[PDB]
Specification:
Strand content of chain A: under 5%
Entry title: Cryo-EM structure of multidrug efflux pump MexAB-OprM (60 degree state)
Number of strands of chain A: 0
Organism of A, B: Pseudomonas aeruginosa
Keywords: Multidrug resistance, efflux
Oligomer: part of a larger assembly
Shape of chain A: rod-shaped
PDB class: membrane protein
Number of helices of chain A: 0
Distance between the termini of chain A: 100 Å
Chains A, B: Multidrug resistance protein MexA
Structural class of chain A: little secondary structure
């Protein structure tokens, strides 16, 4: 009785390496209306 | 030909140089309206955008 062993073979193939990064969403043009005069 | 005095030539030349200084004041102020980068290198991101 020889040792019987489950054996898998390896094969070369391409693999991609994605990542995941958190972050906010800032707008493209966000102006802000500050006045330039003095009054009501 | 000295049809006008040297005194009121030196006054006019002083007025010309003083007005040229007062217009190059406005010329460098227009140079300050546009923003020139003071040194060279990797610029980051804009802190304020168009219209702010």
């Amino acid at each position: 009785q020889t040792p019987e062993v489950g054996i898998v073979t390896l094969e070369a193939q391409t693999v991609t390496l994605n990542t995941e990064l958190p972050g906010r969403t800032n707008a493209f043009r966000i102006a802000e209306v500050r006045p330039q005069v003095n009054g009501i | 030909d000295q049809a006008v005095s040297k005194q009121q030539y030196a006054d006019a030349n002083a007025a010309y140089l003083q007005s040229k200084a007062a217009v190059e004041q406005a010329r460098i102020n227009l140079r300050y309206t546009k923003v020139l980068s003071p040194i060279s290198g990797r610029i980051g991101r804009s802190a304020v955008t168009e219209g702010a």
